[PDB]
Amino acid sequence: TADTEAEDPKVYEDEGVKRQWQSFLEKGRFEGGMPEVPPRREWCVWD
């Protein structure tokens, strides 16, 4: 549910937060560090 995500869903619209997650969404791993903002539920789905 919303417990695992940031309490404010609007944060995922920030470009800064997109950059933190760009490495995980593209390459599966964290290249530039672990994002301080937790992921969206859909990003954690097994492919």
């Binding site: 919303a2 695992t4 995500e5 390459k27 672990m34 097994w46």
Partner: protein, 315 residues
Amino acid sequence: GPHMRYVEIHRNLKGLRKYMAEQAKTNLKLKQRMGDMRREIRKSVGQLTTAANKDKQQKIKSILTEALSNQVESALVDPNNFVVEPRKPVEGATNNDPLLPSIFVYLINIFAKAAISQFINEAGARPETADPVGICVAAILSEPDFLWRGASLIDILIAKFRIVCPVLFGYRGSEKTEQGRQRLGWWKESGQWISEQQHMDRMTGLGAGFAAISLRKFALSKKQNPYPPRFYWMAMAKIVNTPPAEISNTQCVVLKAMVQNYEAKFIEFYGSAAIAALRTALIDFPARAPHKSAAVNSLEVLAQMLKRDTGLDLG
């Protein structure tokens, strides 16, 4: 870092202890009962460690319900002094009154102290014992009876984690300097620093305790999670993102206690993102550490077990 309000709550809670002692002089109904109420909470918390054992959690709930009714005629206090964010009256909330009985906030504070001490004294030597405590903390503080304006009073407990385990909140330091040992929460018994083993034992119990409260699943419950798993995620990220030059063994010990015995729960919540995170915490972070130690090795050992179980490969 650098610093925030969670310390301010710690001071107000210290001032609340004196307030209850002063009332006990004039208030006889408070003196008669307050002491026994304090002890039965600590006793019930200690017993949690040692399957359908629900009689110890109810004894703690019944005492807090009794303190909320305030038969002891205790003075009322402003709960905004014990929460990070001042709260406004919430629609549909069970308690929007601006003040609360001082005995309630006090016994809530004793419940928080009791859980912290259990993490320190028992979970430091046997990390398994932190989980049943965390269950109790989340169960009690989430009861609608104890929600002040729609939210729990968990900030009383988190403020203590900030004092005894600052690394969970982004604080760093060198274990070689006194300014750093303070910033890492290295304790002092009688002026001088405690032994390195007692420090790392504290960090182990507090790290396991933090995971016990931050990795609870509430979707089956009708109650709202007082400290949802997003706080476990943020805490881990602040530690693993530490630049290599500033890593300390204190960080590695807490991180190990955060992960060991909580890998499954972490993966259930965050799935493929948890694997990526565990890769950062158990592979990249130990490799970034400036000096090897039993703490760094323990992480690498966990990395191998998870690499076998999960493959630690999403690519």
